[PDB]
């Protein structure tokens, strides 16, 4: 399948070169997989989600996304126009308030929630969790992410936006999950992207168009935007049967575009997520 005039990041993940604008992908499109977006919520009524998104849990007075961040991230995972995996099921877990903030205890509870809640959902092709959040190092936060991964969920986490070594941030620094840095449309490391040996992969993160609250769209930047590209890619590859939740991060690294990014610090992987789709 081909989506013309796609957001640059979608085109990038199906291309061996920057500078194109068509996204190519197998029409299975993540059908039968599920992606949890652990964030500020999801505006599931947005036409872009086509009935495939739903809120399953909140720790606050509403499950609605009063911020936009979670809706944007969910759109990059699986919206019809802005998403990598256009037929996946999206489940929202609101661990962040409408200012985008959340306590680590709530975030940990949300991760353990997903590890159990997947047993209440139909995801025959596999389960992914996208975590576009983080703060300073916490062994308890890292352990929660490790549990979620161990339970059979492909965990993708943002590296962080500090232009610093991600070893000092959580859950970015957890070795067993997939830690995602950000790149721009010219294959440069995004100016704000964290780096370091704990990164597994880069995805598009600068000037990413996706869904927003109020049935709208906007372009924003962050490792928060790169992470759902990788989460959606994992769901897509799991539906194709090419990998599993436990092996998808390694598979994405194995099949990435290699050595194509600029300003990658010595010791950080030079790997850009790529779907290897041959039309």
Curated annotation (Swiss-Prot):
It catalyses: Hydrolysis of keratin, and of other proteins with subtilisin-like specificity. Hydrolyzes peptide amides. Its EC number is 3.4.21.64. The keyword Calcium applies. GO terms for cellular component: extracellular region. The active site is at 39 (charge relay system), 69 (charge relay system), 224 (charge relay system). Keywords: Calcium, Disulfide bond, Hydrolase, Metal-binding, Protease, Serine protease, Signal, Zymogen. Disulfide bonds join 34-123, 178-249. Transmembrane segments: none annotated. One of its GO terms (molecular function) is metal ion binding. Residues 7-279 form the Peptidase S8 domain. It comes from the Eukaryota. Binds 2 calcium ions per subunit. The keyword Protein biosynthesis does not apply. Its cofactor is Ca(2+). Ca(2+) 1 binds at residues 175, 177, 200. Ca(2+) 2 binds at residues 16, 260. One of its GO terms (biological process) is proteolysis. Belongs to the peptidase S8 family. Hydrolyzes keratin at aromatic and hydrophobic residues. This is Proteinase K. It comes from Parengyodontium album. The chain holds residues 106 to 384 of 384 of the full protein.
């Amino acid at each position: 399948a081909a989506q013309t005039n796609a957001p640059w990041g979608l085109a990038r993940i199906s291309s061996t070169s920057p500078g194109t604008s068509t996204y190519y992908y197998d029409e299975s499109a993540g059908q039968g997989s599920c992606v949890y977006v652990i964030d500020t919520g999801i505006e599931a009524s947005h036409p872009e989600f086509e009935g495939r998104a739903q809120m399953v849990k909140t720790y606050y007075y509403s499950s609605r996304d009063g911020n936009g961040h979670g809706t944007h991230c969910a759109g990059t995972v699986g919206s019809r126009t802005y998403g990598v995996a256009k037929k996946t099921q999206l489940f929202g877990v609101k661990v962040l308030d409408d200012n985008g903030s959340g306590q680590y205890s709530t975030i940990i509870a949300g991760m353990d929630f997903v590890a159990s809640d997947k047993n209440n959902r139909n995801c025959p092709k596999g389960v992914v969790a996208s975590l576009s959040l983080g703060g300073g190092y916490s062994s308890s936060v890292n352990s929660a992410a490790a549990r979620l991964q161990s339970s059979g969920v492909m965990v993708a986490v943002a590296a962080g936006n500090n232009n610093a070594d991600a070893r000092n941030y959580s859950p970015a620094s957890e070795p067993s999950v997939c830690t995602v840095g950000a790149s721009d449309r010219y294959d440069r490391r995004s100016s704000f992207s964290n780096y370091g040996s704990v990164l597994d992969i880069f995805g598009p993160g600068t000037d990413i168009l996706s869904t927003w609250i109020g049935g709208s769209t906007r372009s924003i930047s962050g490792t928060s935007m790169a992470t759902p590209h990788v989460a959606g890619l994992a769901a897509y590859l799991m539906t194709l049967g090419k990998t599993t939740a436990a092996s998808a991060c390694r598979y994405i690294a194995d099949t990435a575009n290699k050595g194509d990014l600029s300003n990658i610090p010595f010791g950080t992987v030079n790997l850009l997520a790529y779907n290897n789709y041959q039309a």
